[PDB]
Ligand binder design. Structure first.
Ligand SMILES: *[C@@H]1O[C@H](CO)[C@@H](O[C@@H]2O[C@H](CO)[C@@H](O)[C@H](O)[C@H]2NC(C)=O)[C@H](O)[C@H]1NC(C)=O
Ligand SMILES: *[C@@H]1O[C@H](CO)[C@@H](O[C@@H]2O[C@H](CO)[C@@H](O)[C@H](O)[C@H]2NC(C)=O)[C@H](O)[C@H]1NC(C)=O
Ligand SMILES: *[C@@H]1O[C@H](CO)[C@@H](O[C@@H]2O[C@H](CO)[C@@H](O)[C@H](O)[C@H]2NC(C)=O)[C@H](O)[C@H]1NC(C)=O
Ligand SMILES: CC(=O)N[C@H]1[C@H]([C@H](O)[C@H](O)CO)O[C@@](O)(C(=O)O)C[C@@H]1O
Ligand SMILES: CC(=O)N[C@H]1[C@H]([C@H](O)[C@H](O)CO)O[C@@](O)(C(=O)O)C[C@@H]1O
Ligand SMILES: *[C@@H]1O[C@H](CO)[C@@H](O)[C@H](O)[C@H]1NC(C)=O
Ligand SMILES: *[C@@H]1O[C@H](CO)[C@@H](O)[C@H](O)[C@H]1NC(C)=O
Ligand SMILES: *[C@@H]1O[C@H](CO)[C@@H](O)[C@H](O)[C@H]1NC(C)=O
Lengths: 175, 322, 322, 175, 322, 175
């Protein structure tokens, strides 16, 4: 959308992932699978739930009673009340509708932003120890066991621990 | 070679959503912000039962319209439910003065108590027993409003009535009375003796003089005569003074009243459903958490904002294009 | 060396746009959301013409003010146009009871048809041809309202009038009548004979008794006397019963009425323009597609939301930097 | 603006481009010229048009008649009507004005974002086979004929196919 | 080794700010959009003083309630300040006809001038100085309203009064008068010879005839009698005509009025504070730059929008994360 | 947040900087220091100040007088006025609250975007003359005195003037 990620360089989402919104898909010798990024998923959830609850709680509701209390020789006042009621319905209808449109758009753009920021998190973690396939996937220039990938997800990935091996396979294949 | 990929959730959701720039965007999860559900019942408002009049108008209920349900001790209510067109209004046809303001006043009442103020048996110089009509039958026999007395000439005179009641109660009370407007001088003479007649009513606040109006009219429920009703709120320790030489519809019962709040009269065919809410609608009660609803305009209570739309869906999840 | 470049549209557009953070941002394309255009005419509402009284008020038109233009009856209208201060209201000075409520009632009418209910030729015991005044001139000669009859004593008696009209039509009809208030008792006796006089009017709903009021007054159009008018809606199969001792301004013509909607009275100096709209303004009609307008507050129809701004411009294109 | 493209690293729009809103300008041995990115332009048009049409169509309009029906002994009620009318005028005016401002900002930023995502798509396609001039233009370290640039737009640009030649001209220009 | 880093401002700010998705967000700088400050004073509205009646109702002030103000001469005012329950209303118990509409009319005045229209010395055939009561005390002595005259029979006659006043002034004037409604025929006779009595008031516009209502009533300030007041606006070159055989509370003083705008009546216990604003509140004035306020609903002037919130804080700076 | 800068790759803001909102922190042979990027800072200030001035000035305020002018037999009209007053209060309260929320989010995101545009500005000036530490910081491949750095700030930085120095300076490090 706005950040070009969700329906952009990442063409499609993962039915496979179930435990969260944004996440990782790994494939090594132990096998393949999905794992959701805890932090970003919870932050996105908290922000969205807070949005909905903000849209709900800011409404001031006080007691009102309505209301057809005028006789057939009081129809001008009845019309005045009609103009008031109809005016308020028009206001609340227009504002509710537009609120929903605008805020829905911002929500989708929010998801886009979240995913892009995730891709940049991993990207910034590995750098040249892996190749950017441009599909949203990273091709490791080295061996990465489950602890290593779980350390990519953790944000704890050790780059020096693999800098040289990746260096070797990079100067082997990246040219 | 080994690989890590970033991607996002997807599902079977067919849930659509609109956006300022895009329509029918299928999405992971969504929440409707518009409330559309009611319980289809009339309920208490905050643990205070409503006053439910069945086939009676407020007038018919206050006055003792004999065709209306027998009177119930109901000391307290939050709002009044009338049907769109109650069958039983005024058994004897006529009018009610400042009726809408009285209905509004009575819409919400903190204490209400019917009280005998002038016994029917104390009009020794007048007929208090013939003031009866076939349009107002009680137990199959012709009668009249039950809280009010239609006085007739005794033997062949109508002596000048001078009567007063002092509100010795500790609460305000609503007092009701009336005039009869006959059709002709013959009927006038026949009912009262006196041809030119009046009813004056006095209070620390009220200074009234009613004169009946003789006029030829159409028959309503077979009658061309009319009954016109009036009311006041008598303060504690204040008195009310009636004087009349004829056409006096005198009080018998009045009502202790305490007012602390206001509501309105609700028009509904529904019936009570042993229930509590903060928002009542003529189609049913609402358990109201949502900020908007589309049920009905004519509500009483702390309700969502009435809105003209069939759906207000907020996207919470993300785009889902399988 | 060879080159690839990303860029965007640009043109000669001078259209600006404001932004929450930036002002006067020249832009590629834009669309104004604010409607500012009218046709300067009075038009139909949904193909239904308005009732346009040029120099008569609603009263002068309903009663037959002889100074009002006698024009082709209009059985149907969607709204009424009056001028701010119409030259011809009540030719004979006085008042109109519940007048604004009647104007509101007549603001939108589905069927309207003038009907003779009591022929002038049937007042054989009273003068129905001397009830005439210089304040109500017709063709340079003294006259009176045309749908209503000023009855005067014939020779030296005013016998008690008893009259009834039964609405045998299938439609409600608007009935109008009046009282005369003379300046002194001498005039009272001179015109009627009886000194103490009344007018009783009876209906299934109405119970009226009017008494003239003698009071010394300032001259209006050379006269100190006053005419006071009253009206009702007579249901089908109901009758109206007049009884009078004198001072009766009797009906001659009444009006068949069908009401299915409401509008209001518009004040405008403009003219009909063989034209249709869904939104009428006193300054002209609006072709309403935009959600906002700034023409005039006093509108009738399905109109845009009235707003106090000169411009609501939406950016569609992009920044246009020269 | 928000994405730093339109009035940012790209100083100005192109009078020359006519076929669309966002697009490309190429110059090779075959010559120079413009070609507008059809797809993203149409997406933008549908989006902005949908925005405006939504702002118009969500308006609820019902019949009202107004309205000076009170006499000189009902001037308190006329004042109640006045407070109502003026109130609605204030609400609608404030909301309309601010809506136009906010959605205008959003629109300009939408254009910004579209152009930027276009630029990033190309950037990620070329990588080090070209130099980022920082003006929004890319200088090829190799020859790119019409068909090749035609492949830059397609999103099918073959990076390995030119990597060696580009490298050559890069370390050649590199002193 | 050499280094460049891009970053952003941070500080000691504790200012929080809320966001649609995040709460309690500490920030660099912020600006409150909600106004909360008043001066606790009553002030002029655009250089026009308010009319501050201290312990008088508008009625007590217009009529000359002797316990009210030695006539607070204010030729010009923007609004009227009354207390919640002014001690001095009508000294003699009774009512004021169309009172609220009169207060609304008088709410904002461009020119106001008390003027003598009928001198007390011109009641040669009636006693114009005994119309005095203990319910209207001045200095321990019985008295009456100062701008209005209680006419009582002289010796033992009340000849028919005929009086007229022609507004030769160039401004409209407010004229006030009244009826006395006694308790009995004895009181009626004692005060006025004639038992059956009237008061007619005539204008080019007004056509009034009042009849007293003798009736037994409760005591108010020890009295069962009642005073009922009436008023009009007499146009320039129009005349007003009173005729009465008794019970007349006659004008002596009337008021030149020029009206160019309207406001309302403000209820406040406060006092003037020699001050100017564009927004007055019963609690104090507002020096108004902010678009919203939470001071009070009952405001007069060009005020911010009243809102039910304790703070409207806009983030201007950036996140300040400690 | 939305642009992944402020609470993203830049872990923290600078107490040290005082001259503005966005800026630079340098450390070379001559020493360290902060310097705020004036242009973009001014743009941000004008934009936010304009935002607030828009929220304030678009408000239409006219004279109104309120207002309890009805007697105890006019309480239906009194209730009509009550419903009007309360209705307008609810409208204004909800709209003001939500306006503040939405625009607060937009402001924070605006700062985020500004910072990102600055980092990318520098990125576009140096390219391979420095290493992106992913910290928001750049590790220079050559000597950069104060006068060198002001041209990064001035935007007048000559990349060729050091292109060779960096070259030699780079593969010496490329062990
Ligand atoms: C109504 O009756 C009550 C009770 O009889 C009256 O209250 C008394 O008034 C008398 C004067 O008449 C006082 O002296 C007493 O102190 C009052 N008694 C109490 C305990 O309240 C009241 O005055 C009567 N009201 C009217 C209008 O007659
Ligand atoms: C007006 O005249 C009509 C026509 O006769 C009256 O209606 C009829 O009343 C008689 C009984 O007297 C019935 O037998 C007819 O069937 C009625 N016709 C209809 C259609 O109602 C009517 O009563 C008269 N109205 C009044 C008030 O006098
Ligand atoms: C009030 O007094 C004035 C002065 O006498 C009257 O106005 C004059 O009336 C006569 C006759 O109509 C004219 O000749 C004068 O030219 C009038 N002068 C003005 C300024 O109008 C006025 O008519 C009196 N009011 C009433 C009710 O008659
Ligand atoms: C007090 C009195 O007279 N009641 C009588 C009335 C009235 O005379 C008129 O009907 C009034 O309109 O008429 C009756 O026929 C009736 O309706 O039952 C008999 C009844 O006893
Ligand atoms: C029915 C009638 O008697 N009309 C006459 C009236 C009345 O005496 C007054 O208008 C009543 O107040 O006076 C006239 O001079 C007039 O107005 O032209 C002559 C007219 O013939
Ligand atoms: C959008 O979705 C609604 C819900 O099913 C449907 O009624 C409408 O036809 C859809 N529009 C299109 C073009 O798919
Ligand atoms: C915006 O343009 C209008 C019309 O030319 C002009 O009145 C106004 O001064 C401009 N605003 C600014 C800030 O320049
Ligand atoms: C936000 O901050 C306030 C102090 O101003 C604190 O009292 C409150 O608990 C916080 N709200 C929450 C729970 O987010």
């Amino acid at each position: 959308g706005l950040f070009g990620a969700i329906a952009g360089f990442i063409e499609g989402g993962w039915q496979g992932m179930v435990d969260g919104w944004y996440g990782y898909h790994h494939s090594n010798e132990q096998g393949s699978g999905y794992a959701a990024d805890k932090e970003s998923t919870q932050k996105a959830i908290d922000g969205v739930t807070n949005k909905v609850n903000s849209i709900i709680d800011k409404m001031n509701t006080q007691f009102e009673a309505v209301g057809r209390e005028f006789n057939n020789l009081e129809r001008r006042i009845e019309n005045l009340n009609k103009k008031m009621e109809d005016g308020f319905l028009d206001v609340w209808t227009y504002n509710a509708e537009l609120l929903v449109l605008m805020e829905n758009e911002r929500t989708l753009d929010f998801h886009d932003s979240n995913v892009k920021n995730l891709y940049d998190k991993v990207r910034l973690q590995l750098r040249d120890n892996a190749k950017e396939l441009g599909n949203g996937c990273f091709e490791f220039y080295h061996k990465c066991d489950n602890e290593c990938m779980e350390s990519v997800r953790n944000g704890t990935y050790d780059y020096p621990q693999y800098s040289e091996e990746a260096r070797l396979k990079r100067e082997e294949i990246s040219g | 070679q080994d690989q890590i990929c970033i991607g996002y959730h997807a599902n079977n959701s067919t849930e659509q959503v609109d956006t300022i720039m895009e329509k029918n965007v299928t999405v992971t999860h969504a929440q409707d912000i518009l409330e559309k559900k009611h319980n289809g019942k009339l309920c208490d408002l905050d643990g205070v039962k409503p006053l439910i009049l069945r086939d009676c108008s407020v007038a018919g209920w206050l006055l003792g319209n004999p065709m209306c349900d027998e009177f119930i001790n109901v000391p307290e209510w939050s709002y009044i439910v009338e049907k769109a067109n109650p069958v039983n209004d005024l058994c004897y046809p006529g009018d009610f003065n400042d009726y809408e303001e009285l209905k509004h006043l009575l819409s919400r009442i903190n204490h209400f108590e019917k009280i005998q103020i002038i016994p029917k048996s104390s009009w020794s110089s007048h007929e208090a027993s013939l003031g009866v009509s076939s349009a107002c039958p009680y137990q199959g026999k012709s009668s009249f409003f039950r809280n009010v007395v239609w006085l007739i000439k005794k033997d062949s005179t109508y002596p000048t009535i001078k009567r007063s009641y002092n509100n010795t109660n500790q609460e305000d009370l609503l007092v009701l009375w009336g005039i009869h407007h006959p059709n002709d001088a013959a009927e006038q003479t026949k009912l009262y003796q006196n041809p030119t007649t009046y009813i004056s009513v006095g209070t620390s606040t009220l200074n009234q003089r009613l004169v009946p109006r003789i006029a030829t009219r159409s028959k309503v429920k077979g009658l061309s005569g009319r009954m016109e009703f009036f009311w006041t709120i008598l303060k504690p320790n204040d008195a009310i003074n009636f004087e009349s030489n004829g056409n006096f519809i005198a009080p018998e019962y009045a009502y202790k009243i305490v007012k602390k709040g206001d509501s309105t009269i609700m028009k509904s065919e529904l019936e009570y459903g042993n229930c509590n809410t903060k928002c009542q609608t003529p189609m049913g009660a609402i358990n109201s958490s949502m900020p908007f609803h589309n049920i009905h305009p004519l509500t009483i209570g702390e309700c969502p904002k009435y809105v003209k739309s069939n759906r207000l869906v907020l996207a919470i999840g993300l785009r889902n294009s399988p």
